[PDB]
Amino acid sequence: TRIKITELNPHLMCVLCGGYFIDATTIIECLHSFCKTCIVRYLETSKYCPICDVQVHKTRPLLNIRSDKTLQDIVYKLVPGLFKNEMKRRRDFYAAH
Amino acid sequence: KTWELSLYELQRTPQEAITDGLEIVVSPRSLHSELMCPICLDMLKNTMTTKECLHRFCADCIITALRSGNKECPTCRKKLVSKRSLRPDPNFDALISKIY
Ligand SMILES: [Zn+2]
Ligand SMILES: [Zn+2]
Ligand SMILES: [Zn+2]
Ligand SMILES: [Zn+2]
């Protein structure tokens, strides 16, 4: 019934920022996942997966990534306070800018 | 899709892990329908994922559906040429093996 979140953490975390998935994005070839912002900036200087080193696309990496609606749904549902927190950070940013 | 990053996105910082011993209430799975397979309505088992659209099924169920001669995806009805059009993901499997 009750599971320690520290046990689920490793499946809910982006390897490029070391935090939870925000706008989770999955590589089609190997199916590893990352935050949208982390994988997009990474794929600017590389065409190989950060985790397993497999080639994402011959020439245009962004062609072989997808938004992972399902994965992001799970993360938001499992990690308490996470969703409220991201929405707030964005609210705080636009008010400042 | 362009994958243009917004002003907020260009500046965002990580969402840090909750490392203190917090327990999550998962007594019912009527709060987590993303762990249930659309075909059989069970806990996804040996999860297969469609490359193009990222919909997840038990290996059992999606192989059967393709073997029926129907080349559409059971979730979104988008075409699939073959079983080379889907990949296994040990990540979802391992996630599910911890929760139930
Ligand atoms: Zn990240
Ligand atoms: Zn990979
Ligand atoms: Zn199934
Ligand atoms: Zn689909």
Swiss-Prot record, chain A:
Q: How does it assemble?
A: Component of a PRC1-like complex. Identified in a PRC1-like HPRC-H complex with CBX2, CBX4, CBX8, PHC1, PHC2, PHC3 RING1 and RNF2. Interacts with RNF2/RING2. Interacts with RING1. Part of a complex that contains RNF2, UB2D3 and BMI1, where RNF2 and BMI1 form a tight heterodimer, and UB2D3 interacts only with RNF2. The complex composed of RNF2, UB2D3 and BMI1 binds nucleosomes, and has activity only with nucleosomal histone H2A. Interacts with CBX7 and CBX8. Interacts with SPOP. Part of a complex consisting of BMI1, CUL3 and SPOP. Interacts with E4F1. Interacts with PHC2.
Q: What about PTM?
A: Monoubiquitinated. May be polyubiquitinated; which does not lead to proteasomal degradation.
| Induction (UniProt) | Down-regulated by oxidative stress.
- What's its job? Component of a Polycomb group (PcG) multiprotein PRC1-like complex, a complex class required to maintain the transcriptionally repressive state of many genes, including Hox genes, throughout development. PcG PRC1 complex acts via chromatin remodeling and modification of histones; it mediates monoubiquitination of histone H2A 'Lys-119', rendering chromatin heritably changed in its expressibility. The complex composed of RNF2, UB2D3 and BMI1 binds nucleosomes, and has activity only with nucleosomal histone H2A.
Give any extra note attached to this record. The hPRC-H complex purification reported by PubMed:12167701 probably presents a mixture of different PRC1-like complexes.
Outcome after substituting D73E? Increases stimulation of RNF2 ubiquitin ligase activity
Please indicate the residue ranges that the annotation assigns to the motif Nuclear localization signal. 77-91
Does the entry annotate any disulfide bonds, and if so which pairs?
A: none
Q: Which organism is it from?
A: Homo sapiens (Human)
Q: Which residues cross the membrane?
A: none
Chain's gene name: BMI1
- Locations listed in the record: Nucleus; Cytoplasm
Source organism, top-level taxon: Eukaryota
Zinc fingers, RING-type class: 14-53
Q: What is this protein called?
A: Polycomb complex protein BMI-1
Swiss-Prot record, chain B:
- Compartment(s) of residence: Nucleus; Cytoplasm; Chromosome
Connected disease: Luo-Schoch-Yamamoto syndrome: An autosomal dominant disorder characterized by intrauterine growth retardation, severe intellectual disability, behavioral problems, early-onset seizures, feeding difficulties, and dysmorphic features. White matter abnormalities and delayed myelination are observed on brain imaging.
Name the reported effect of H55Y.
Loss of HIP2-binding and loss of ubiquitin ligase activity on histone H2A
Keyword Transmembrane on entry: no
- So what does mutating K79A actually do? Mildly decreases ubiquitin ligase activity on histone H2A
What is the stated purpose of this protein?
E3 ubiquitin-protein ligase that mediates monoubiquitination of 'Lys-119' of histone H2A (H2AK119Ub), thereby playing a central role in histone code and gene regulation. H2AK119Ub gives a specific tag for epigenetic transcriptional repression and participates in X chromosome inactivation of female mammals. May be involved in the initiation of both imprinted and random X inactivation.
This protein's species is: Homo sapiens
For this UniProt record, the keywords arranged alphabetically read as follows: Acetylation, Chromosome, Cytoplasm, Disease variant, Epilepsy, Intellectual disability, Isopeptide bond, Metal-binding, Nucleus, Phosphoprotein, Repressor, Transcription, Transcription regulation, Transferase, Ubl conjugation, Ubl conjugation pathway, Zinc, Zinc-finger
Q: Where's the Glycyl lysine isopeptide (Lys-Gly) (interchain with G-Cter in ubiquitin) crosslink?
A: K98
ZnF RING-type span: 37-77
- Impact of altering S27 to A/D? No effect on ubiquitin ligase activity on histone H2A
Recorded protein name is: E3 ubiquitin-protein ligase RING2
**PTM text:** Monoubiquitinated, by auto-ubiquitination. Polyubiquitinated in the presence of UBE2D3 (in vitro).
The effect annotated for S68R is: In LUSYAM; uncertain significance
Q: Name one GO cellular component term.
A: nucleus
Q: Which residues carry this modification: Phosphoserine?
A: S27
Effect recorded for C37W: Strong decrease in HIP2-binding
GO BP: any one term: negative regulation of transcription by RNA polymerase II
Gene Ontology molecular function: any one: RING-like zinc finger domain binding
Q: Could you name the domain of life of the organism this protein comes from?
A: Eukaryota
Subunit notes for this chain?
Component of chromatin-associated Polycomb (PcG) complexes. Component of a number of PRC1-like complexes; these complexes contain either the polycomb group ring finger protein PCGF1, or PCGF2, or PCGF3, or PCGF4, or PCGF5, or PCGF6. Part of a complex that contains RNF2, UB2D3 and BMI1; within that complex RNF2 and BMI1 form a tight heterodimer, where UB2D3 interacts only with RNF2. The complex composed of RNF2, UB2D3 and BMI1 binds nucleosomes, and has activity only with nucleosomal histone H2A. Part of a complex that contains PCGF5, RNF2 and UBE2D3.
The residues of the intact protein that this chain contains are 15 to 114 of 336
Q: What's the miscellaneous note?
A: The hPRC-H complex purification reported probably presents a mixture of different PRC1-like complexes.
